[PDB]
From Swiss-Prot, chain B:
UniProt site (Participates in the substrate recognition with KAPA and in a stacking interaction with the adenine ring of SAM): 17
The protein's name in its UniProt record: Adenosylmethionine-8-amino-7-oxononanoate aminotransferase
PANTHER family on file: ADENOSYLMETHIONINE-8-AMINO-7-OXONONANOATE AMINOTRANSFERASE
Keyword Repressor: no
Reaction catalysis annotation: (8S)-8-amino-7-oxononanoate + S-adenosyl-L-methionine = S-adenosyl-4-methylsulfanyl-2-oxobutanoate + (7R,8S)-7,8-diammoniononanoate
Superkingdom as given in the UniProt entry: Bacteria
PROSITE patterns assigned to the protein according to its UniProt record, in alphabetical order: AA_TRANSFER_CLASS_3 (PS00600)
Species in which this protein is naturally found: Escherichia coli (strain K12)
Predominant cellular place of this UniProt entry's protein: cytoplasm
Regulation: Inhibited by amiclenomycin. S-adenosyl-L-(2-hydroxy-4-methylthio)butyric acid and adenosine are competitive inhibitors with SAM and uncompetitive inhibitors with KAPA as substrates. S-adenosyl-L-ethionine, adenine and 8-keto-7-aminopelargonic acid are non-competitive inhibitors with both substrates.
Xref: NCBIfam families: bioA, PRK05964.1, PRK07986.1
Subunit structure as annotated in this protein's UniProt entry: Homodimer.
Gene name linked to the record: bioA
N6-(pyridoxal phosphate)lysine found at: 273
């Protein structure tokens, strides 16, 4: 990788949520292995991000590699219309067995935003089949569910700048962000806003959608499990469907296999992604109940009306199967728990830094919330120079390392976080 | 795959656009090679579908396989936020170079539906940045652009059953399906389109269409003059033109991009399917410097999109290998030869009672029938003839890999001709 490569990139390749006219530097990566990224210049970095939550087994995992390669020898891809195959059957068997019992129908898809679009269409069609007029969704502020239009319609109107689409996006219902903390106690006052919205609109709501326990892209917030317990019952009483978006939280990140387990509730529709494939390639899954799946098929349409070109991709299903096989060992329960204790201990000192507003930790997620926004170009350069890959965002400096990270590797991460927030050098 | 494996699939796995209650037979595929699918019981089938148009180089292609395994050795995936890599860079150089000049900025994403959503968002943000109140899209009837909410809002309201979402989908503008065939041009065809453009030109963010071929909405093949006329109309009104070539891209209609038939360049280009040689999902939406900068110079400060797996190294490497195969140029004659054989071998369907029309363009052969095909029965019959062909609605069509052999293509067409004789397989 030459500097002409980097110039081409800067001038012709869009990157996620980043200006094409006022660019910040990007770092060229050549390879990766275990918990390290390897830059083109040979510099090796400890990954604190898991490539956005997904690489829970790290990079170049032998089990993942061998499974992907074996699938390539049989067939990387074949269409899923009128056809089925072992990787898909194998993955759906595991998905069904590992999630709440009522969740037993699987619709595989390409991306997380699409899995959400799928969950929403399922809710709309479900009610359209029962002859009811339910077309609205009830969600929480600070929620994020994807960038496609449907998903955008249930994201925080602020964070996602809904003023850009005012008039195009449908107007859904936004209860206040849950206030009670996962580190703290329950407050019954938290529920007034949500309760108010439900009473006023209980009749037009097709479903409730939320991220269980951790609201990610919307502030890395961690709220009280009592919330899910409540929402599940309200939904049960009103006959409304519950959509849980575990695209970020699925597969052990929060300390439990699925974050819904923190409340011991099961949703009607469950969306998975990211760690599903061990972060090797995009794949998503939306699981639902027999009740939902059958109802839709008996309506006008005759079928749930969705079907992406690469649905069921054998290659990605094989990787996902290998990723779940690793998790079947159970070794993750202990890795995540130990990561939890080290993040609590080693980030605790940050609370005393001037620039810091809050330190919070759950499973393999450690968050340092600051008072002012980070200077991206500057803080990123600093992290790289310490030999770590940490990608902060706004006022959040956070870690979500692979579950196989070594204590020494984790310590490099937390020490770099602690040092970054010691002064205002890297702020504004 | 045991019988219990198949039982599980049927009861627990949702398949595309198909019922969970009256589910219809699926066939268990164990592997694939060349232009053939291989079932669990060893039966071999000539693929007439290219896995929904994507596998233009067939299956288990050594050049595609090697590029994939090699990229796996380096890293199948790494995030694209603040990071870049070679597969993405190399793929982007090819896309920019192979497309019309103005298209020089690439937004990679995961799937076709998403690529269309990206194109729509680019248009909305573009106009938001120029302070213009423009939120309508102008599209054609019989068009199909995907399954996500934004994409649905520009699909044919009848074919896509818009009544189901009536009230959720934004109301867009739908000009008449283009009548002139790919055939003689009739100026009267433009009346609909013009009537919508005049009354709404002040409102319209972009015109979106599939060039030359409207696939899923009916395999319709229209006259290139439309593209010429729409491009000029868009230039005049300062409206953006979005060309969805997710199905037409990479050689399918006889040219690299269907837009060439009219020698036109859109403002935004959507690509997918054949992009990776049908090995795994990936998409790209290309646009101009004007669009890309305007957006970044607006209030949001950047284009507001960024999926987790954006720029996936593995997919990018596969796509690089797919584009390299095309670089050899061989597809040019492969497709022309297929076109010839399809025209010749499907011509006899014009004597069959069940047939309404036979039309062909590049590696697309269509036998539109007089009545609703019975997909399950016909599917079984095709499997028994040793071929894979998936009908729908009133179309029995073929879109084979570019490398299909003459005797293999002969099977598909013979089966098609045999199928339509006979009332058996219909309604
Ligand atoms: C022109 C065009 N634009 C967008 C998309 C969406 O791409 P995805 O990758 O999101 O799907 C497509 C996809 N086209 C389709 C091709 C075939 C089928 C199936 C039709 C029929 N019901 C059958 O099963 O045989 C559906 C969509 C596209 O073409
Ligand atoms: C909770 C959650 N939902 C949905 C998405 C959307 O996933 P994608 O970026 O693959 O479309 C992300 C990322 C996420 O974190
Ligand atoms: N669901 C997600 C959406 C966006 C991201 C990226 C968020 C932030 N813009 C960042 O760059 O880290 C991560 C997850
Ligand atoms: Na289950
Ligand atoms: Na170009």
């Amino acid at each position: 990788m030459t500097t002409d490569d980097l110039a081409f990139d800067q001038r012709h390749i869009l990157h996620p949520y980043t200006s094409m006219t006022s660019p910040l530097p990007v770092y060229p990566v050549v390879s990766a292995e275990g918990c390290e990224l390897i830059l083109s210049d040979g510099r090796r970095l400890v990954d604190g991000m898991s490539s956005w939550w997904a690489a829970i087994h790290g990079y170049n995992h032998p089990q993942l590699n061998a499974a992907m390669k074996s699938q390539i020898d049989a067939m990387s891809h074949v269409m899923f219309g009128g056809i089925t195959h072992a990787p898909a059957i194998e993955l759906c068997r595991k998905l069904v067995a590992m999630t709440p019992q009522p969740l037993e129908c699987v619709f595989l898809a390409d991306s997380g935003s699409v899995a959400v679009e799928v969950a929403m269409k399922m809710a709309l069609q479900y009610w359209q089949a029962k002859g009811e007029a339910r077309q609205r969704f009830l969600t929480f502020r600070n929620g994020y569910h994807g960038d496609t239009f449907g998903a955008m319609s249930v994201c925080d109107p602020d964070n996602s700048m809904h003023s850009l689409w005012k008039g195009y996006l449908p107007e859904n219902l936004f209860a206040p962000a849950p206030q009670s903390r996962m580190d703290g106690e329950w407050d019954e006052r938290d529920m007034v806003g949500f309760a108010r919205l439900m009473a006023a609109h209980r009749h037009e709501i097709a479903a409730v959608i939320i991220e269980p326990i951790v609201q990610g892209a919307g502030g890395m917030r961690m709220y009280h499990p009592e919330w899910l317990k409540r929402i599940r019952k309200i939904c049960d009483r009103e006959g409304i469907l519950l959509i849980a978006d575990e695209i970020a939280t699925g597969f052990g990140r929060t300390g439990k296999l699925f974050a819904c387990e923190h409340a011991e509730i099961a949703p009607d529709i469950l969306c998975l992604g990211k760690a599903l494939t061990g972060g090797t390639m995009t794949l998503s899954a939306t699981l639902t109940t027999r009740e939902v799946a059958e109802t839709i098929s008996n309506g006008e349409a005759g079928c749930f009306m969705h079907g992406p070109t690469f649905m069921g991709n054998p290659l990605a299903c094989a990787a996902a199967n290998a990723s779940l096989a690793i998790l079947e060992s159970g070794d993750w329960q202990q890795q995540v728990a130990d990561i939890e204790v080290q993040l609590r201990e080693q980030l605790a000192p940050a609370r005393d830094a001037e620039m810091v507003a809050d330190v919070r930790v759950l499973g393999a997620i450690g968050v340092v919330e600051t008072t002012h926004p980070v200077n991206m170009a500057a803080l990123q350069k600093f992290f790289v120079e310490q030999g770590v890959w940490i990608r902060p965002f706004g006022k959040l400096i956070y870690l979500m390392p692979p579950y196989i990270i070594l204590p020494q590797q984790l310590q490099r991460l937390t020490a770099a976080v602690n040092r970054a927030v010691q002064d205002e050098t890297f702020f504004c």
